[PDB]
Amino acid sequence: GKCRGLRTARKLRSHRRDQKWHDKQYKKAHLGTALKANPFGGASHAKGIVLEKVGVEAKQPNSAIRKCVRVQLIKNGKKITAFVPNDGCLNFIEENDEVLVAGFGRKGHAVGDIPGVRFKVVKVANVSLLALYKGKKERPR
Amino acid sequence: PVARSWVCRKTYVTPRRPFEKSRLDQELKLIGEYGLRNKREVWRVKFTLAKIRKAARELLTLDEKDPRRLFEGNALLRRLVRIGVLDEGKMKLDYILGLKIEDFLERRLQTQVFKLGLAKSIHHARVLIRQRHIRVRKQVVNIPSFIVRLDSQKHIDFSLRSPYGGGRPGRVKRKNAKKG
Amino acid sequence: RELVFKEDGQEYAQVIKMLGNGRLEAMCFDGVKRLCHIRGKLRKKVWINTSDIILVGLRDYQDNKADVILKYNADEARSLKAYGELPEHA
Amino acid sequence: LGSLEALLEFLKTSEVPYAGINIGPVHKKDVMKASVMLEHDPQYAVILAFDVRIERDAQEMADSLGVRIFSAEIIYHL
RNA sequence: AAAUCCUUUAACGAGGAUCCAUUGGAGGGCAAGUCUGGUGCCAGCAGCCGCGGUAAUUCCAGCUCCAAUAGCGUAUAUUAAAG
RNA sequence: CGGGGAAUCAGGGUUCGAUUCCGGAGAGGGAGCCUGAGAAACGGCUACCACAUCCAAGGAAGGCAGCAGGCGCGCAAAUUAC
Hints:
Protein name (chain D): Eukaryotic translation initiation factor 5B
Number of strands of chain A: 6
Helix content of chain A: 10-25%
Strand order of the largest sheet of chain B: 1-2
Number of domains of chain B: 1
Structural class of chain B: mainly alpha
Number of helices of chain A: 4
Organism (chain D): Homo sapiens
Strand content of chain B: under 5%
Shape of chain A: elongated
Helix content of chain B: 40-55%
Family (chain D): Belongs to the TRAFAC class translation factor GTPase superfamily. Classic translation factor GTPase family. IF-2 subfamily.
Distance between the termini of chain A: 72 Å
Distance between the termini of chain B: 64 Å
Organism (chain A): Homo sapiens (Human)
Oligomer: part of a larger assembly
Radius of gyration of chain B: 21 Å
Number of domains of chain A: 1
Subcellular location (chain D): Cytoplasm
């Protein structure tokens, strides 16, 4: 039962205000705990240096070696694993290059197949991977 | 601080569902019938009609004796009679709700140039207007989306300079005349 | 099936301590021990045992891992013994 | 730049590989490139700085991590 | 202010009018191909369900088609959908 | 920083508002004061704290969160113009 009385504005507001914390989205958002834990720290894209290339196996129902890159970020200097998008894009990357990585799409969660990766590489050595894939540019030498 | 205004407005609303048969057809019929460039031009007229309908709807809710409703209602009806989507007989606020997109698309300069028989196709009219051949009153307009006023209808003439009307041969005729 | 003397970006390995959930961890004839993943078609169809000779697809980026291409048996092992494979037993 | 060539041809003669090069004073991105090296080969994670101003944020970041910086105005010392 | 841009107007300027329209898709959600080469649970696609293990409607291509259009993808904060 | 407001939106609401108008605040951090109707002023001074320029080593001079511009920082932002 909800109190409906004309002088229950404080009771309703107090209840609604404190009961919003049991909402997953509101608590993750408003409490400054997601931000510090987030490797980017509330930034759409982030830049890093490549450690090494790595082959991550897919989930149980369908088997394949997903090509990925271990990258250390520039701002906070912590290690993450980024998934290179299109076919043969791993060839264009080399170890110890400067790489711009973006969120995958699902708001900092995993993908259908590739487990334990949040991020995907968008630029390599200040050149877009789409341009290197479509051959509109060439890796600067 | 700068002596500039930042009063800019969006004139079209995109549809809620992007891919929907029955809708896409209806918009393409409108384009096909009135030779419009893209679906932005149909959404523009939908948005303008919607805003007029919302103004009529929010006026209806007020009482029949209110000075504000009377003044605003008369002004809206006067403007819609002026533009030529109604007549003096059907000049009640209730009838504003009984308009549709056809009524507004009929008043495009492109459409009127085609309907008065200056151009011989709905596609030819848009080109003819854009090429600076058409003029209303003594003013040369090249805007297909120029919405013609009811009293301004009875004179759309060829701009005098124009080869078609004025009497001066263009590049093609000049070049053919020199090599003739 | 025919003999396959293929040493073209892929190495022969002796399976040792095959513990994992597909992990494997065998000892390659040329280099050091590596984790050789059970490739799609070898998941349920072909069974690799605790001590076995395998041709592993040397995946050269990281080099601390690989994937098992082919399983061998006694006759093919004895043949491989004959040409090129160390006096290491089969 | 002349000094940078001089240091690189010395490293070439002494047989040491070099990853990154830069002109001007040392910054926190430079010590971070020295840090991202530290994972690979602990010895190689060093900055050879000749006749340039070390920054406080770079120096304290270098001391907080396992990154050493060789500062010297006379090249003999470097 | 002096110029620029625009408007005005002599001369030149359209037949692959080569004076060239892109960005994303074509199994469902969701508009559009069980067409033809290539690869063979490898390479990759896929927001989600899923497609790939030798006739792939979904991968890399060719052709064709759809969507919006001088714009259209992608990531991320936020609003409606969220009774 | 707070308002005037902004985005979205059936009705109710939710979220944003450093940013051209109004009010407040501070000129690297604090503190003290001269002049003046008005300042605890920084394109005024005096001292300390942090940085840093010239030097004949005796002393001297500092303040872009004004317009340009540069370095740094980072995913993120223009011309040393008339």
